[PDB]
Structures are given as C-alpha cells and as structure tokens.
Amino acid sequence: SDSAINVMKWKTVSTIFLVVVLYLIIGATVFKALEQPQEISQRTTIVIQREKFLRAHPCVSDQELDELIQQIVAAINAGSHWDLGSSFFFAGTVITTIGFGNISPRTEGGKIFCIIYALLGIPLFGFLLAGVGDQLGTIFGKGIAKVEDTFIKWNVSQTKIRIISTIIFILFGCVLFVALPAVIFKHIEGWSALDAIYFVVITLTTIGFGDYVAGGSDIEYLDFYKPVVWFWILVGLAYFAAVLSMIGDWLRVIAKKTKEAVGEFRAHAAEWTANV
C-alpha cells in the first residue's frame, strides 16, 4: 500500500514540524526576555539625548532636527565600500550565502547581476567547499590513525573509543577554527572575547547578521590580515558544515531514545494498570 507509506512519512514530518514550531516559541520568548529590557533603557536614553540636544543648544529646534533625521535615515540606504577590494568581499558573501548585507547592490542592474551571479555562484562554491571539506576530512584521518595505535589498543576497548575520537575532532576543531581566530579578532579587530566567538559562529554558520564584520570597521588592518580571513572562511565554513552535520546525527540518535523512553513510560503505565 503506497498511501500507507506516505501516511507514515507525513506523520514523521508533522511531528518534527511541531518540534520546530515549539522550538521557535521557546526561543522567541527567551530572546524577548533577554533583549526586551535593553531596548527600553537604550530607547529611553536615546530620548534623553534628543531632549538634551535641544535644551543644551538653543541654536537647534525641532523644525531643523526632524529634517536632519530624515537625511540620516536616507543615509542608511547609501551607507568607498564598492571599490575593487570591498566588492570582491561582497562577491564572497554572495556565493557563500553569508550575506552580511552591510554592503548590498543598490542599482537595478546590480540587483539583476547579483541574482544571476548568486544562482550560478552558490552551486559552484558548493563544489569547492565539498573538496576543501574532503581534504580537511582526510587530513584529520591521518591524524587519528597515529592516535589509534598509541592508547586505543590499551585499556579501554575500541567500542567506546569512537566516542573519544569525536571529542578530539571537536576539541582541536574549536581551537584552530574558533579559538585562534577569535583571539586574533579580539586584538586586531578590537572585539570582546564574547563578540569574537559570536562573530565566528554567526559567520561560519552562514547566518551573517552583519553586526560584526572582520575587516569591515574602517581603521588599521595589517597587510596580510584580510587574505587570512578568506582562507579561514573557506576552511571554517567546512568545519561547521561537518559539525552541524554531526549535531544533526546526535539528534536522530536522541530522537529515538526519547521516542522509546516514551514507549517505556507508557508501558509501565500499561502493566502497572493491569495489576490493580
């Protein structure tokens, strides 16, 4: 029965859908809980700054200030960040689906070329990202081969070592691809320890908020700083690519433990019910 297999699939999809919808509701409340207060204090202090500017300076009134604000808002639409170097940056953001968006095409023509460029670029880059990831994955293979002959054969059996190996991949991976670049971002880019990691994650996950852009701030980079972040991204995006895939498998493993843990809990409702 073909429609029976499809009923099993829609049952699976529909539950995950709710888990997602539920995951959204939970997060939506946690963010508002965290961000709501700062918005009020920050939005109240900005109000004190308008009232203080007209009081401190009789020179300016409400008639000139509103006209001023209208010009700054328009300045948001504009912002050279389209020079040879920044555009090459823009292209990278386009084909990686990071899209920080701080610099986006404002021309009807640039919008058309961006569309085409993206549709052709993103798949192209995917092949590269696949090879880079494959290379890095095999490099990792040579490393664990050296480690699997030292202290794998000794005490603990090989059945539980696969758990130890996965921890090594995360340890080093976090150090090289997260820790080191975050350290560098802090000093060079001036970002706090947290803001550094925040950038690393929101970037290598292709989220790309744009609130933190390494090399985006306008002042004083080193000669080879920008080229090194490019390489970090090519290899960084591949790392989270695997990491995100691993976390995915953790979920399909767990999803079963909870699904049978619910069958257990119902079971010992069942017989516990018949013994009464």
Place this chain on the structure above:
Amino acid sequence: SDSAINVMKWKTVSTIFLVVVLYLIIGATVFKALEQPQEISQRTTIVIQREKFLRAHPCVSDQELDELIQQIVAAINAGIIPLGASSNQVSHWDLGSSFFFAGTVITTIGFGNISPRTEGGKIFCIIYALLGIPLFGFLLAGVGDQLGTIFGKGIAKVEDTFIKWNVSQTKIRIISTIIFILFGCVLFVALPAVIFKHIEGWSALDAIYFVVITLTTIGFGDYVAGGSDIEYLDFYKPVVWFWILVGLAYFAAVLSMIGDWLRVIAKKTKEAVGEFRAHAAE
C-alpha cells in the same frame, strides 16, 4: 591505490579553487562597475547636504556636530525612532518579532536588521543556532520529500498524456525538469513576488530580488517582507512563514540541479578541451 586517488582528488579541488578565485574576480569587477558610480554621486550630494547645513546656523557646535551623527548611526544598529513627532514607539523585540528573529537564525537567512545587543542573548543565540540549524535541517528535508512526492503524482498524470508511440525515456526527463522549473518559479517566485509588490510596496524587481536573496539564505536584510509597520492584515505574515518553509525547500532542489548542470558543462568542456588539443593544430 588508496593514496593514488587522494593525489588525484587534490588535483580537482585545486582547479575548482582557481575557477572560484576567477569567478570572484569577474564578479567583483562587475559589481564595482555597476555600484561605484552611484556611490560617488550619492557621496558627493550627501556632502552637499552637510555643507548646506553647516553654514545654515552660525550658532551650531560646528566640529562637535559631526560627532552627533556618529551617535545616531551607532544607535541605528538597534531600532531607534528619534523624532519629536509621534513619541510613541513600537518594540522590535516584541513577541512577534523575536519569533521572526529565531526563524532567521535557524534558516541561516540572518537578515540582521534586528540582532541581539545583550551578552546573554548572544550566548543564547550561539547555542540556539548550533542546535536550531541542524534541527530545522530535518524539517526542510521532510518538507522537501513531501513537496517532491506531490510533484511525482502530478508528473505521473502528464507522462501518460503527451506520451505517444516512438518515445525515448531519456529525452522525456528533460521535459519533466522543465515543468518542475516552470510551475516552481510560478508558485514560489512569481506569485509571492506579485503579493510583495502590492502589499509591501516593492517594485517588481525588488520583490524578485528579495525572493532570490531570501530563499537562497543569503539574507542581506535590505529588504524584509513584513518589516515596516504598515498594517499587515495578519492573513499575510503567517503565509510568508509557510512560503519560507516551502520556498527554501524549492531552491534547495533548484540550486542542487544547477550544480548538476555545472558538473555536466564541466565534462563537456573538459573533453571539448581534449578534442581541441587532439586536432586544433593541423
């Protein structure tokens, strides 16, 4: 044999790397060619607006005036309505917008228009995405499967209609691939674009632009459906959410198709180069 193929793989990756390097170069030159002129005309006229306002009031704090703008821009990263008229203010972290924000996180669209300002929200965003992204991955795959089978039912209808005697199985696949694109761009691109134009006030190009930038998960943020306050009947926002679920599913397959074409154009060109080397000399 094991290490032989390894040496062979690096050969392919290195060539693709260079192709990408060259692809970024050509792109960079094409964007700055398009965007550089308008950047200049806008940056010269803005200087005209600052000079026009400098001599306007001799009693201004001249040098400290440019410091004020720095404070406004620094405040623009977060939602700010700094105007005397209509002091009433709408929250961008309310229950409805924060829900949106989470959707942008787990879909890796990241419009960035509204991002966490708090050290706590940032630490939760990290955890949220790391677990959220992979989770939403399964959903998108499930919605990819469902939407796919519903298509397999539709083509099973047309494959017995146009089918006649003396037909080839390999050539009909090209027909199906076209109808997939056709109806796809209609429902998930054409239809939503038109709605975006009227309801959201966007131009026909800005709507398509938004769609492509969004459903490819690029997420500039320069255009966001439902961003401005306007009215939003509320028959609208829920739809957009659904469109996103399926629209992301659609491009996922579309983008994966283009990759197959590129791979194809890759072999034809690679043997076309072997042909040209074979003969070409004469």
